[PDB]
């Protein structure tokens, strides 16, 4: 995927995810960022981790070089929160992450890859259409219909488990990134 795109990665870092699976989410995300043409004139990356609260791990406003992002990604500490505050994470995207004041490029399309393995603990609202969310529902505990609603028009990328996530999802994520749509 090589394009002007403001990509958000939203990783659930809840206790229900656990550090191991979150590290797999990180590794998936790293792989995606690695595959993506991340650069100042191309793909911009914001990284959010959420559980109880949302951490902007990397805002769009910070240096948009693959190296800087990937290194901050490696530095992302699993928060292990007791909630899956997906709605809050989504609100961060709409009301923070994708604000021009936070480094969002107004003319760049907005794409969110939200890795979640659990139902939202909180109220979820489908984001304004200008923020495209591709929910990555990982594991059997993903609330798929919730993800479908959050995701619309994007079909959730359903991954059987977090072990498979870094293996299978990057391809799907980058396909989605490049084409603007999910497969079939």
Nearer to Ca ion, 43 or 172 (CB): 43
Nearer to Ca ion, 3 or 108 (CB): 108
Give the three-state DSSP class for 156.
Answer: coil
Q: Minimal distance in Å, beta carbon 147 to Ca ion?
A: 22
Nearer to Ca ion, 52 or 96 (CB): 96
Judged by CB under 5 A, the stretch of 2-10, 34-42, 73-81, 88-96 that binds Ca ion is 2-10
Q: Which residues pair with 45 in a beta bridge?
A: 7
Site for Ca ion in 100-139 (CB under 5 A): 104-105, 108, 110
Q: Minimal distance in Å, beta carbon 129 to Ca ion?
A: 13
The number of residues that bind Ca ion (CB under 5 A) is 5
Nearer to Ca ion, 59 or 117 (CB): 59
Q: Minimal distance in Å, beta carbon 42 to Ca ion?
A: 13
Is there a contact between 162 and 170 (Cβ–Cβ < 8 Å)?
Answer: no
Judged by CB under 5 A, the stretch of 4-12, 112-120, 135-143, 174-182 that binds Ca ion is 4-12
- Residue 116's nearest CA partner among 167, 165, 60, 180 is 165
* Residue 55 touching Ca ion (CB under 5 A): no
* Residue 6 touching Ca ion (CB under 5 A): yes
Q: In terms of C-beta density within 10 A (0-12 exposed, 13-18 middle, 19 or more buried), how is residue 20 classed?
A: exposed
Nearer to Ca ion, 112 or 142 (CB): 112
Secondary structure element (H or E) that encloses residue 119, with its range? none
What is the gyration radius of the CA atoms in the chain, in angstroms?
14
Q: Minimal distance in Å, beta carbon 19 to Ca ion?
A: 31
Binding residues for Ca ion, per CB under 5 A?
Answer: 6, 104-105, 108, 110
């Amino acid at each position: 995927c090589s394009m002007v795109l403001d990509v958000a990665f939203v990783l659930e870092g809840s206790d229900k995810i656990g550090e191991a699976d979150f590290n797999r989410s990180k590794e998936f995300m790293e792989e995606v960022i690695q595959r993506m043409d991340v650069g100042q004139d191309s793909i911009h990356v914001t990284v959010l981790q959420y559980s109880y609260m949302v951490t902007v791990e990397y805002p769009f406003s910070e240096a948009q070089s693959k190296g800087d992002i990937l290194q901050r990604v490696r530095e992302i500490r699993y928060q292990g929160g007791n909630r899956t505050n997906t709605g809050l994470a989504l609100r961060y995207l709409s009301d923070h992450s994708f604000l021009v004041s936070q480094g969002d490029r107004e003319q760049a399309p907005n794409l969110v890859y939200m890795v979640t393995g659990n139902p939202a603990s909180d109220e979820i609202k489908r984001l304004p259409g200008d923020i495209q969310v591709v929910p990555i529902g990982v594991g059997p505990n993903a609330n798929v219909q919730e993800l479908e609603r959050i995701g619309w028009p994007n079909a959730p990328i359903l991954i059987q488990d977090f072990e498979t996530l870094p293996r299978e999802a990057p391809d799907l994520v980058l396909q989605r990134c490049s084409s603007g749509e999910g497969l079939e």
